[model samples]
Target: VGQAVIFLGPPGAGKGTQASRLAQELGFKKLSTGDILRDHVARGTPLGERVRPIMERGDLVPDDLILELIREELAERVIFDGFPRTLAQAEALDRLLSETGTRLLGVVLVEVPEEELVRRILRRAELEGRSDDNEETVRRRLEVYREKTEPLVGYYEARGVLKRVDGLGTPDEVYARIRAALGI
Candidate 1:
Protein backbone atom coordinates (compact mmCIF):
# COMPACT_ATOMS: atom_id res chain seq x y z
CA VAL A 1 0.00 0.00 0.00
CA GLY A 2 1.02 3.63 0.57
CA GLN A 3 1.69 5.40 3.87
CA ALA A 4 -0.19 5.44 7.17
CA VAL A 5 0.13 8.17 9.81
CA ILE A 6 -1.59 8.36 13.16
CA PHE A 7 -2.21 11.79 14.74
CA LEU A 8 -2.04 11.76 18.52
CA GLY A 9 -2.48 14.67 20.93
CA PRO A 10 -4.38 16.05 23.86
CA PRO A 11 -7.39 18.33 23.41
CA GLY A 12 -6.67 21.83 22.07
CA ALA A 13 -3.26 20.71 20.82
CA GLY A 14 -3.82 21.82 17.22
CA LYS A 15 -3.62 18.25 15.94
CA GLY A 16 -6.60 18.91 13.68
CA THR A 17 -4.91 21.86 11.98
CA GLN A 18 -1.82 19.87 11.07
CA ALA A 19 -3.84 16.85 10.10
CA SER A 20 -5.97 18.84 7.66
CA ARG A 21 -2.94 20.51 6.12
CA LEU A 22 -1.06 17.22 5.76
CA ALA A 23 -4.04 15.55 4.14
CA GLN A 24 -4.40 18.32 1.58
CA GLU A 25 -0.71 18.73 0.84
CA LEU A 26 0.03 15.01 0.61
CA GLY A 27 -3.28 14.06 -1.06
CA PHE A 28 -4.00 11.57 1.71
CA LYS A 29 -7.54 10.73 2.68
CA LYS A 30 -8.44 11.65 6.24
CA LEU A 31 -10.28 9.14 8.39
CA SER A 32 -12.02 10.47 11.46
CA THR A 33 -14.51 8.81 13.81
CA GLY A 34 -17.24 11.39 13.26
CA ASP A 35 -17.05 10.98 9.51
CA ILE A 36 -17.02 7.20 9.81
CA LEU A 37 -20.03 7.24 12.08
CA ARG A 38 -21.90 9.47 9.67
CA ASP A 39 -20.95 7.25 6.76
CA HIS A 40 -22.15 4.21 8.65
CA VAL A 41 -25.47 5.90 9.38
CA ALA A 42 -26.03 7.14 5.85
CA ARG A 43 -25.30 3.71 4.45
CA GLY A 44 -27.53 2.07 7.07
CA THR A 45 -24.88 -0.48 7.86
CA PRO A 46 -25.33 -2.80 10.83
CA LEU A 47 -22.83 -0.70 12.74
CA GLY A 48 -25.02 2.30 12.05
CA GLU A 49 -27.70 0.71 14.17
CA ARG A 50 -25.07 0.15 16.85
CA VAL A 51 -23.69 3.71 16.69
CA ARG A 52 -26.84 5.75 16.07
CA PRO A 53 -27.96 5.68 19.67
CA ILE A 54 -24.54 6.78 20.92
CA MET A 55 -24.12 9.41 18.19
CA GLU A 56 -27.49 10.88 18.97
CA ARG A 57 -26.30 11.44 22.53
CA GLY A 58 -22.77 12.61 21.50
CA ASP A 59 -21.18 9.89 23.57
CA LEU A 60 -17.71 8.40 23.17
CA VAL A 61 -18.24 5.50 20.82
CA PRO A 62 -16.68 2.25 21.97
CA ASP A 63 -13.15 1.28 20.80
CA ASP A 64 -13.74 -1.99 18.90
CA LEU A 65 -16.64 -0.53 16.95
CA ILE A 66 -14.62 2.53 16.03
CA LEU A 67 -11.67 0.32 15.11
CA GLU A 68 -13.87 -1.61 12.72
CA LEU A 69 -14.90 1.64 11.09
CA ILE A 70 -11.25 2.73 10.79
CA ARG A 71 -10.32 -0.58 9.21
CA GLU A 72 -12.93 0.00 6.54
CA GLU A 73 -11.70 3.51 5.66
CA LEU A 74 -8.05 2.59 5.63
CA ALA A 75 -6.67 1.09 2.43
CA GLU A 76 -3.62 2.68 0.79
CA ARG A 77 -2.20 5.60 2.73
CA VAL A 78 -4.78 7.24 4.97
CA ILE A 79 -4.34 9.64 7.86
CA PHE A 80 -6.13 8.47 11.00
CA ASP A 81 -7.20 11.25 13.39
CA GLY A 82 -9.08 9.19 15.93
CA PHE A 83 -9.89 5.69 17.16
CA PRO A 84 -7.32 3.52 18.97
CA ARG A 85 -8.03 5.31 22.19
CA THR A 86 -6.65 2.52 24.35
CA LEU A 87 -3.65 0.21 24.50
CA ALA A 88 -5.71 -2.70 23.21
CA GLN A 89 -6.90 -0.69 20.23
CA ALA A 90 -3.36 0.49 19.51
CA GLU A 91 -2.11 -3.07 19.55
CA ALA A 92 -4.91 -4.12 17.27
CA LEU A 93 -3.99 -1.31 14.87
CA ASP A 94 -0.44 -2.68 14.55
CA ARG A 95 -1.75 -6.10 13.50
CA LEU A 96 -4.43 -4.59 11.32
CA LEU A 97 -1.95 -2.46 9.40
CA SER A 98 0.44 -5.38 9.00
CA GLU A 99 -2.36 -7.59 7.74
CA THR A 100 -3.27 -4.95 5.17
CA GLY A 101 0.31 -4.98 3.84
CA THR A 102 0.94 -1.49 5.17
CA ARG A 103 2.99 -0.28 8.10
CA LEU A 104 2.73 2.87 10.19
CA LEU A 105 5.37 5.50 9.41
CA GLY A 106 4.95 7.13 12.80
CA VAL A 107 2.49 8.44 15.35
CA VAL A 108 2.61 12.28 15.57
CA LEU A 109 2.19 13.58 19.07
CA VAL A 110 1.22 17.25 19.52
CA GLU A 111 2.67 18.26 22.82
CA VAL A 112 0.96 21.18 24.59
CA PRO A 113 1.07 22.98 27.91
CA GLU A 114 -1.69 22.33 30.45
CA GLU A 115 -2.81 25.90 31.04
CA GLU A 116 -2.90 26.69 27.38
CA LEU A 117 -4.81 23.52 26.74
CA VAL A 118 -7.54 24.49 29.18
CA ARG A 119 -7.81 28.03 27.88
CA ARG A 120 -7.81 27.01 24.24
CA ILE A 121 -10.39 24.29 24.80
CA LEU A 122 -12.71 26.64 26.67
CA ARG A 123 -12.47 29.20 23.92
CA ARG A 124 -13.15 26.54 21.33
CA ALA A 125 -16.19 25.33 23.19
CA GLU A 126 -17.61 28.81 23.47
CA LEU A 127 -16.86 29.64 19.84
CA GLU A 128 -18.29 26.40 18.50
CA GLY A 129 -21.28 26.40 20.85
CA ARG A 130 -20.52 22.83 21.76
CA SER A 131 -22.67 23.20 24.87
CA ASP A 132 -21.56 19.88 26.25
CA ASP A 133 -18.01 21.13 26.73
CA ASN A 134 -18.46 22.79 30.07
CA GLU A 135 -15.53 23.19 32.44
CA GLU A 136 -16.28 20.01 34.35
CA THR A 137 -16.85 17.96 31.23
CA VAL A 138 -13.72 19.35 29.61
CA ARG A 139 -11.64 18.51 32.65
CA ARG A 140 -13.01 15.00 32.82
CA ARG A 141 -12.47 14.47 29.12
CA LEU A 142 -8.86 15.64 29.39
CA GLU A 143 -8.34 13.44 32.39
CA VAL A 144 -9.76 10.44 30.58
CA TYR A 145 -7.59 11.23 27.58
CA ARG A 146 -4.46 11.20 29.74
CA GLU A 147 -5.45 8.18 31.79
CA LYS A 148 -6.82 6.03 29.02
CA THR A 149 -4.91 7.03 25.90
CA GLU A 150 -1.58 8.69 26.70
CA PRO A 151 0.19 5.39 27.10
CA LEU A 152 -0.29 4.77 23.40
CA VAL A 153 2.66 7.06 22.76
CA GLY A 154 4.93 4.75 24.70
CA TYR A 155 3.58 1.73 22.84
CA TYR A 156 4.38 3.23 19.47
CA GLU A 157 7.59 4.76 20.77
CA ALA A 158 8.82 1.34 21.75
CA ARG A 159 8.37 0.37 18.12
CA GLY A 160 10.34 3.44 16.99
CA VAL A 161 7.21 5.04 15.56
CA LEU A 162 6.47 7.88 17.96
CA LYS A 163 7.31 11.40 16.78
CA ARG A 164 6.46 14.51 18.74
CA VAL A 165 5.98 18.11 17.60
CA ASP A 166 5.73 21.10 19.88
CA GLY A 167 2.10 22.21 19.83
CA LEU A 168 2.95 25.79 20.79
CA GLY A 169 2.69 27.71 17.57
CA THR A 170 0.50 28.69 14.64
CA PRO A 171 -1.01 26.02 12.39
CA ASP A 172 1.68 26.54 9.79
CA GLU A 173 4.42 26.47 12.38
CA VAL A 174 3.08 23.26 13.88
CA TYR A 175 2.80 21.70 10.42
CA ALA A 176 6.44 22.57 9.82
CA ARG A 177 7.31 20.78 13.03
CA ILE A 178 5.34 17.76 11.86
CA ARG A 179 7.20 17.73 8.58
CA ALA A 180 10.49 17.81 10.41
CA ALA A 181 9.40 15.15 12.88
CA LEU A 182 8.20 12.77 10.19
CA GLY A 183 10.97 13.80 7.80
CA ILE A 184 8.36 14.50 5.17
Candidate 2:
Protein backbone atom coordinates (compact mmCIF):
# COMPACT_ATOMS: atom_id res chain seq x y z
CA VAL A 1 0.00 0.00 0.00
CA GLY A 2 1.79 3.11 -1.25
CA GLN A 3 -0.08 5.33 1.16
CA ALA A 4 0.33 7.18 4.43
CA VAL A 5 -1.85 7.54 7.52
CA ILE A 6 -1.59 9.92 10.43
CA PHE A 7 -2.83 9.54 13.97
CA LEU A 8 -4.04 12.67 15.73
CA GLY A 9 -5.33 12.90 19.26
CA PRO A 10 -4.86 15.03 22.32
CA PRO A 11 -2.80 13.66 25.20
CA GLY A 12 -4.10 10.50 26.87
CA ALA A 13 -6.16 9.49 23.85
CA GLY A 14 -3.93 6.35 23.47
CA LYS A 15 -3.22 7.23 19.86
CA GLY A 16 0.44 6.28 20.17
CA THR A 17 -0.27 2.80 21.39
CA GLN A 18 -2.86 2.19 18.75
CA ALA A 19 -0.79 3.72 16.00
CA SER A 20 2.15 1.46 16.80
CA ARG A 21 -0.09 -1.57 16.89
CA LEU A 22 -1.58 -0.78 13.51
CA ALA A 23 1.85 -0.18 12.07
CA GLN A 24 3.17 -3.43 13.40
CA GLU A 25 0.36 -5.41 11.83
CA LEU A 26 0.50 -3.58 8.55
CA GLY A 27 4.32 -3.41 8.32
CA PHE A 28 4.21 0.35 8.10
CA LYS A 29 6.67 2.60 9.85
CA LYS A 30 5.11 4.50 12.78
CA LEU A 31 6.87 7.82 13.02
CA SER A 32 6.98 10.19 15.96
CA THR A 33 8.88 13.48 15.81
CA GLY A 34 9.60 13.72 19.52
CA ASP A 35 11.12 10.27 19.75
CA ILE A 36 13.06 10.57 16.53
CA LEU A 37 14.53 13.94 17.37
CA ARG A 38 15.43 12.77 20.84
CA ASP A 39 17.23 9.77 19.41
CA HIS A 40 19.14 11.90 16.95
CA VAL A 41 20.30 14.29 19.65
CA ALA A 42 21.14 11.48 22.04
CA ARG A 43 23.20 9.75 19.37
CA GLY A 44 24.76 13.02 18.26
CA THR A 45 23.91 12.61 14.63
CA PRO A 46 24.36 15.55 12.25
CA LEU A 47 20.69 16.38 12.58
CA GLY A 48 21.09 16.37 16.34
CA GLU A 49 23.59 19.21 16.03
CA ARG A 50 21.24 21.11 13.75
CA VAL A 51 18.36 21.04 16.25
CA ARG A 52 20.25 21.22 19.53
CA PRO A 53 21.11 24.89 19.19
CA ILE A 54 17.68 25.80 17.94
CA MET A 55 16.23 24.15 21.02
CA GLU A 56 18.85 25.79 23.24
CA ARG A 57 17.77 29.23 22.06
CA GLY A 58 14.37 28.62 23.66
CA ASP A 59 12.81 28.82 20.25
CA LEU A 60 10.61 26.26 18.64
CA VAL A 61 12.52 24.30 16.05
CA PRO A 62 11.93 25.44 12.50
CA ASP A 63 9.25 23.57 10.56
CA ASP A 64 11.67 22.83 7.74
CA LEU A 65 14.14 21.21 10.14
CA ILE A 66 11.40 19.02 11.51
CA LEU A 67 10.36 18.10 7.97
CA GLU A 68 13.90 17.04 7.14
CA LEU A 69 13.93 14.69 10.12
CA ILE A 70 10.52 13.34 9.11
CA ARG A 71 11.78 12.76 5.60
CA GLU A 72 14.01 9.99 6.94
CA GLU A 73 10.92 8.04 7.98
CA LEU A 74 9.06 8.62 4.73
CA ALA A 75 8.05 5.53 2.83
CA GLU A 76 5.33 4.13 0.62
CA ARG A 77 3.62 2.69 3.70
CA VAL A 78 3.89 4.72 6.87
CA ILE A 79 2.08 6.16 9.87
CA PHE A 80 2.61 9.55 11.47
CA ASP A 81 2.08 10.86 14.93
CA GLY A 82 3.10 14.25 16.30
CA PHE A 83 4.25 16.62 13.59
CA PRO A 84 2.67 19.29 11.47
CA ARG A 85 1.58 21.25 14.53
CA THR A 86 0.68 24.31 12.48
CA LEU A 87 -1.31 24.90 9.33
CA ALA A 88 1.95 26.03 7.79
CA GLN A 89 3.59 22.76 8.72
CA ALA A 90 0.63 20.89 7.32
CA GLU A 91 0.97 22.71 4.02
CA ALA A 92 4.68 22.03 3.93
CA LEU A 93 4.03 18.37 4.73
CA ASP A 94 1.57 18.15 1.84
CA ARG A 95 4.22 19.56 -0.47
CA LEU A 96 6.82 17.16 0.89
CA LEU A 97 4.49 14.21 0.39
CA SER A 98 3.56 15.28 -3.12
CA GLU A 99 7.21 15.64 -4.10
CA THR A 100 7.96 12.17 -2.76
CA GLY A 101 5.02 10.57 -4.57
CA THR A 102 3.49 9.44 -1.29
CA ARG A 103 -0.30 9.40 -1.26
CA LEU A 104 -2.17 10.65 1.79
CA LEU A 105 -4.30 7.71 2.73
CA GLY A 106 -6.13 9.07 5.76
CA VAL A 107 -5.69 11.44 8.64
CA VAL A 108 -7.27 9.72 11.62
CA LEU A 109 -8.58 11.87 14.41
CA VAL A 110 -8.90 9.98 17.70
CA GLU A 111 -11.88 11.70 19.29
CA VAL A 112 -12.14 11.38 23.06
CA PRO A 113 -14.11 13.57 25.42
CA GLU A 114 -12.13 16.14 27.36
CA GLU A 115 -13.53 15.11 30.72
CA GLU A 116 -12.53 11.51 30.21
CA LEU A 117 -9.02 12.53 29.25
CA VAL A 118 -8.77 14.69 32.36
CA ARG A 119 -9.81 11.72 34.44
CA ARG A 120 -7.26 9.55 32.71
CA ILE A 121 -4.54 12.10 33.33
CA LEU A 122 -5.41 12.43 36.99
CA ARG A 123 -5.27 8.71 37.42
CA ARG A 124 -1.78 8.50 35.85
CA ALA A 125 -0.43 11.38 37.91
CA GLU A 126 -1.71 9.83 41.10
CA LEU A 127 -0.23 6.50 40.17
CA GLU A 128 3.22 7.94 39.45
CA GLY A 129 2.97 10.65 42.10
CA ARG A 130 3.50 13.43 39.58
CA SER A 131 2.94 16.47 41.74
CA ASP A 132 3.04 18.78 38.75
CA ASP A 133 0.42 16.90 36.81
CA ASN A 134 -2.39 19.15 37.93
CA GLU A 135 -5.64 19.93 36.20
CA GLU A 136 -4.51 23.38 35.09
CA THR A 137 -1.52 21.97 33.20
CA VAL A 138 -3.73 19.43 31.48
CA ARG A 139 -6.29 22.11 30.72
CA ARG A 140 -3.79 24.48 29.18
CA ARG A 141 -2.07 21.75 27.17
CA LEU A 142 -5.39 20.68 25.68
CA GLU A 143 -6.47 24.23 24.98
CA VAL A 144 -3.33 24.67 22.93
CA TYR A 145 -3.85 21.31 21.30
CA ARG A 146 -7.36 22.28 20.25
CA GLU A 147 -6.33 25.70 19.03
CA LYS A 148 -3.63 24.21 16.83
CA THR A 149 -5.20 20.90 15.76
CA GLU A 150 -8.85 21.67 15.04
CA PRO A 151 -7.94 23.51 11.87
CA LEU A 152 -5.94 20.55 10.59
CA VAL A 153 -9.03 18.40 10.99
CA GLY A 154 -10.91 20.83 8.82
CA TYR A 155 -8.06 20.89 6.33
CA TYR A 156 -8.00 17.12 5.88
CA GLU A 157 -11.76 16.75 5.92
CA ALA A 158 -11.93 19.23 3.08
CA ARG A 159 -9.57 16.89 1.26
CA GLY A 160 -11.98 13.98 1.95
CA VAL A 161 -9.53 11.91 4.04
CA LEU A 162 -10.40 12.73 7.64
CA LYS A 163 -11.43 9.69 9.64
CA ARG A 164 -12.82 10.31 13.09
CA VAL A 165 -12.82 7.53 15.67
CA ASP A 166 -14.52 7.23 19.06
CA GLY A 167 -11.45 6.83 21.23
CA LEU A 168 -13.46 6.37 24.42
CA GLY A 169 -13.46 2.65 25.05
CA THR A 170 -11.11 -0.31 25.52
CA PRO A 171 -7.85 -0.17 23.59
CA ASP A 172 -8.78 -3.11 21.36
CA GLU A 173 -12.25 -1.71 20.83
CA VAL A 174 -10.81 1.61 19.78
CA TYR A 175 -8.21 -0.09 17.62
CA ALA A 176 -10.89 -2.07 15.81
CA ARG A 177 -12.89 1.10 15.31
CA ILE A 178 -9.83 2.79 13.90
CA ARG A 179 -9.25 -0.04 11.44
CA ALA A 180 -12.83 0.32 10.30
CA ALA A 181 -12.44 4.06 10.00
CA LEU A 182 -9.41 3.67 7.75
CA GLY A 183 -10.96 0.65 6.04
CA ILE A 184 -7.60 -1.07 6.49
Candidate 3:
Protein backbone atom coordinates (compact mmCIF):
# COMPACT_ATOMS: atom_id res chain seq x y z
CA VAL A 1 0.00 0.00 0.00
CA GLY A 2 3.02 2.28 -0.12
CA GLN A 3 5.24 3.93 -2.70
CA ALA A 4 8.39 6.02 -2.60
CA VAL A 5 10.33 8.53 -4.67
CA ILE A 6 13.98 9.52 -4.57
CA PHE A 7 15.43 12.91 -5.41
CA LEU A 8 19.12 12.93 -6.36
CA GLY A 9 21.17 16.04 -6.99
CA PRO A 10 24.38 17.84 -6.28
CA PRO A 11 24.97 20.86 -4.05
CA GLY A 12 22.64 23.80 -4.69
CA ALA A 13 20.70 22.15 -7.48
CA GLY A 14 17.60 22.92 -5.39
CA LYS A 15 16.80 19.23 -5.02
CA GLY A 16 15.80 19.59 -1.38
CA THR A 17 13.87 22.74 -2.08
CA GLN A 18 11.95 20.95 -4.82
CA ALA A 19 11.52 17.79 -2.80
CA SER A 20 10.19 19.83 0.09
CA ARG A 21 7.46 21.22 -2.09
CA LEU A 22 6.59 17.83 -3.55
CA ALA A 23 6.21 16.12 -0.19
CA GLN A 24 4.28 18.72 1.80
CA GLU A 25 2.03 20.00 -0.91
CA LEU A 26 1.68 16.67 -2.65
CA GLY A 27 1.23 14.61 0.54
CA PHE A 28 4.17 12.36 1.28
CA LYS A 29 6.66 12.19 4.12
CA LYS A 30 9.93 13.85 3.22
CA LEU A 31 12.72 11.67 4.55
CA SER A 32 15.99 13.52 4.58
CA THR A 33 18.50 10.89 5.68
CA GLY A 34 21.05 13.59 6.34
CA ASP A 35 18.79 15.36 8.82
CA ILE A 36 17.82 12.12 10.51
CA LEU A 37 21.44 11.03 10.75
CA ARG A 38 22.41 14.31 12.37
CA ASP A 39 19.53 14.11 14.83
CA HIS A 40 20.56 10.62 15.89
CA VAL A 41 24.05 11.89 16.57
CA ALA A 42 22.73 14.95 18.29
CA ARG A 43 20.64 12.80 20.64
CA GLY A 44 23.46 10.28 21.14
CA THR A 45 21.45 7.16 20.52
CA PRO A 46 23.41 3.90 20.28
CA LEU A 47 23.13 4.35 16.54
CA GLY A 48 24.46 7.85 16.99
CA GLU A 49 27.46 6.61 18.91
CA ARG A 50 28.21 4.26 16.06
CA VAL A 51 27.57 6.92 13.46
CA ARG A 52 29.50 9.79 15.02
CA PRO A 53 32.96 8.39 14.52
CA ILE A 54 32.29 7.56 10.90
CA MET A 55 30.92 11.04 10.35
CA GLU A 56 33.75 12.61 12.31
CA ARG A 57 36.24 10.81 10.15
CA GLY A 58 34.60 12.48 7.10
CA ASP A 59 33.53 9.14 5.70
CA LEU A 60 30.11 8.11 4.51
CA VAL A 61 28.36 5.91 7.02
CA PRO A 62 28.13 2.35 5.79
CA ASP A 63 25.01 1.43 3.81
CA ASP A 64 23.76 -0.99 6.42
CA LEU A 65 23.84 1.81 8.96
CA ILE A 66 21.96 4.25 6.78
CA LEU A 67 19.70 1.52 5.41
CA GLU A 68 18.73 0.84 9.00
CA LEU A 69 17.85 4.46 9.54
CA ILE A 70 15.69 4.47 6.45
CA ARG A 71 14.24 1.21 7.60
CA GLU A 72 13.16 2.77 10.85
CA GLU A 73 11.57 5.64 8.97
CA LEU A 74 9.63 3.46 6.54
CA ALA A 75 5.95 4.17 6.15
CA GLU A 76 3.08 4.69 3.68
CA ARG A 77 4.46 7.35 1.38
CA VAL A 78 7.91 8.91 1.29
CA ILE A 79 10.30 10.97 -0.79
CA PHE A 80 13.99 10.43 -0.09
CA ASP A 81 15.99 13.61 -0.22
CA GLY A 82 19.49 12.20 -0.33
CA PHE A 83 19.61 8.61 0.79
CA PRO A 84 21.01 5.88 -1.45
CA ARG A 85 23.78 8.35 -2.13
CA THR A 86 26.02 5.64 -3.52
CA LEU A 87 25.38 2.73 -5.87
CA ALA A 88 25.88 0.23 -3.07
CA GLN A 89 23.48 2.13 -0.89
CA ALA A 90 20.93 2.11 -3.69
CA GLU A 91 21.31 -1.64 -3.94
CA ALA A 92 20.82 -1.98 -0.21
CA LEU A 93 17.73 0.16 -0.46
CA ASP A 94 16.37 -2.09 -3.21
CA ARG A 95 16.48 -5.09 -0.92
CA LEU A 96 14.96 -3.09 1.91
CA LEU A 97 12.17 -1.86 -0.33
CA SER A 98 11.55 -5.31 -1.72
CA GLU A 99 11.30 -6.97 1.68
CA THR A 100 9.12 -4.14 2.95
CA GLY A 101 6.83 -4.33 -0.11
CA THR A 102 7.36 -0.71 -0.97
CA ARG A 103 7.61 0.29 -4.60
CA LEU A 104 9.98 3.01 -5.69
CA LEU A 105 7.91 5.14 -8.03
CA GLY A 106 10.85 6.95 -9.59
CA VAL A 107 14.22 8.58 -9.09
CA VAL A 108 14.37 12.25 -10.02
CA LEU A 109 17.75 13.79 -10.68
CA VAL A 110 18.09 17.55 -10.95
CA GLU A 111 20.83 18.44 -13.40
CA VAL A 112 22.59 21.68 -14.13
CA PRO A 113 25.51 21.85 -16.46
CA GLU A 114 28.30 21.20 -13.95
CA GLU A 115 29.77 24.62 -14.54
CA GLU A 116 26.40 26.32 -14.14
CA LEU A 117 25.82 24.56 -10.86
CA VAL A 118 29.34 25.47 -9.87
CA ARG A 119 28.83 29.06 -10.90
CA ARG A 120 25.50 29.42 -9.16
CA ILE A 121 26.66 28.31 -5.73
CA LEU A 122 28.35 31.58 -4.76
CA ARG A 123 25.04 33.39 -4.51
CA ARG A 124 23.41 30.53 -2.66
CA ALA A 125 26.39 30.56 -0.35
CA GLU A 126 25.62 34.17 0.49
CA LEU A 127 21.88 33.63 0.81
CA GLU A 128 22.27 30.63 3.05
CA GLY A 129 24.70 32.52 5.29
CA ARG A 130 27.34 29.91 4.78
CA SER A 131 30.48 31.75 5.75
CA ASP A 132 32.65 28.79 4.91
CA ASP A 133 31.22 28.44 1.41
CA ASN A 134 33.54 29.26 -1.44
CA GLU A 135 33.97 28.12 -5.02
CA GLU A 136 36.72 25.64 -4.12
CA THR A 137 34.58 24.10 -1.40
CA VAL A 138 31.57 24.10 -3.72
CA ARG A 139 33.53 22.26 -6.40
CA ARG A 140 34.42 19.55 -3.93
CA ARG A 141 30.81 19.16 -2.94
CA LEU A 142 29.71 18.80 -6.56
CA GLU A 143 32.71 16.58 -7.18
CA VAL A 144 31.53 14.06 -4.61
CA TYR A 145 28.05 14.02 -6.12
CA ARG A 146 29.38 13.20 -9.56
CA GLU A 147 31.27 10.20 -8.26
CA LYS A 148 28.73 9.03 -5.69
CA THR A 149 25.40 9.93 -7.27
CA GLU A 150 25.87 10.10 -11.05
CA PRO A 151 26.09 6.37 -11.38
CA LEU A 152 22.51 6.19 -10.20
CA VAL A 153 21.34 7.69 -13.48
CA GLY A 154 22.32 4.65 -15.50
CA TYR A 155 21.05 2.26 -12.88
CA TYR A 156 17.61 3.81 -12.61
CA GLU A 157 17.37 4.43 -16.32
CA ALA A 158 17.81 0.75 -17.00
CA ARG A 159 15.00 0.15 -14.54
CA GLY A 160 12.81 2.69 -16.41
CA VAL A 161 12.34 4.76 -13.27
CA LEU A 162 14.71 7.66 -13.86
CA LYS A 163 13.57 11.23 -14.44
CA ARG A 164 16.22 13.67 -15.52
CA VAL A 165 15.13 17.31 -15.20
CA ASP A 166 16.86 20.38 -16.50
CA GLY A 167 17.31 22.47 -13.41
CA LEU A 168 18.22 25.48 -15.51
CA GLY A 169 15.47 27.99 -14.98
CA THR A 170 13.30 29.24 -12.15
CA PRO A 171 12.34 26.87 -9.34
CA ASP A 172 8.85 26.64 -10.80
CA GLU A 173 10.33 25.73 -14.14
CA VAL A 174 12.37 22.92 -12.71
CA TYR A 175 9.41 21.82 -10.66
CA ALA A 176 7.33 21.54 -13.79
CA ARG A 177 10.02 19.53 -15.50
CA ILE A 178 10.02 17.02 -12.67
CA ARG A 179 6.25 16.78 -12.66
CA ALA A 180 6.17 16.22 -16.40
CA ALA A 181 9.11 13.85 -16.41
CA LEU A 182 7.57 11.75 -13.71
CA GLY A 183 4.14 12.03 -15.31
CA ILE A 184 2.79 13.47 -12.11
Over 4 Å off, model 3? 37-61, 126-137
lDDT tens digits, residue span 88-176, model 2: 98899889888888888789899999999999998999999889878999999999999889999999899998999999989999999
Taking all chains together, the TM-score of candidate 2 against the true structure is 0.88
Give one digit per residue, the lDDT tens place, for model 1 in 26-139: 877888877767887999988788788997897877777777777777867788787567788888878888888876778999998877898888998889888887778888
Worst window of 10 by summed lDDT in candidate 2 = 61-70
Q: Would you list the C-alpha lDDT of every candidate in the order shown?
A: 0.83, 0.88, 0.84
Candidate 3 C-alpha lDDT tens digits along 51-75: 8999889897777777888889999
Top-TM-score structure, candidate number: 2
Indicate which candidate wins on lDDT.
Answer: 2
Model 1 spans with C-alpha error above 4 angstroms: 45-68, 125-140
